[PDB]
């Protein structure tokens, strides 16, 4: 859920996912259309596609557990869903971290009306 994902984002980026990444570009939020604004936004686009490939799960709601071994996030075995959701979140949190050098404040509080056109996963 947003609880676990938010925790990873803070640990990896040092920034509170909300409000830092909850209104970023076209894909970091609830939106889901248009061309991603930058690398960070693409991380969210990819995260959405990952979640979109978990039809048999409830990404945003399902709770899962994870640990950190040797400074890295480790998704332990739970239900198939918990494991997959964890992996989607892990990949995105790290993606955010890897691209912090191009995180742009100008893309915060981005209005969805500027985002249109379905982009294929």
């Amino acid at each position: 859920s947003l609880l676990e994902f938010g925790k990873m984002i803070l640990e990896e980026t040092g920034k509170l996912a909300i409000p830092s990444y909850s209104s970023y570009g076209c894909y970091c939020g609830w939106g889901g259309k248009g061309t991603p604004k930058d690398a960070t936004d693409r991380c969210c686009f990819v995260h959405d596609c990952c979640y979109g490939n978990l039809p048999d799960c409830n990404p945003k709601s399902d709770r899962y557990k994870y640990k950190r071994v040797n400074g890295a996030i480790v998704c332990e075995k739970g239900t198939s869903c918990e494991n997959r959701i964890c992996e989607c979140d892990k990949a995105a949190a790290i993606c955010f971290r890897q691209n912090l050098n191009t995180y742009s404040k100008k893309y915060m509080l981005y209005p969805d009306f500027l985002c249109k056109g379905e982009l294929k996963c």
Partner: peptide, 5 residues
Amino acid sequence: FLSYK
């Protein structure tokens, strides 16, 4: 305990 999307 804090990410959307």
